[PDB]
Amino acid sequence: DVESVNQKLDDVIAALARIEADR
């Protein structure tokens, strides 16, 4: 559902933040 989609996107956004900080 919408909650599950939101929660997976939150994981996606945290991984993106780590990747960009590792530049």
Q: How far is the CB of 16 from a copy of itself (least distance, A)?
A: 4
Q: Output the smallest distance, CB 4 to a copy of itself, in A.
A: 7
DSSP calls for the chain: -HHHHHHHHHHHHHHHHHHHHT-
**At its nearest, how many Å lie between a copy of itself and the CB of residue 17?**
7
* Rounded alpha-carbon distances, angstroms, from residue 3 to 18, 19, 20: 23, 25, 26
**Which residues are at the interface with a copy of itself (CB under 8 A)?**
2, 4-6, 8-13, 15-20, 22-23
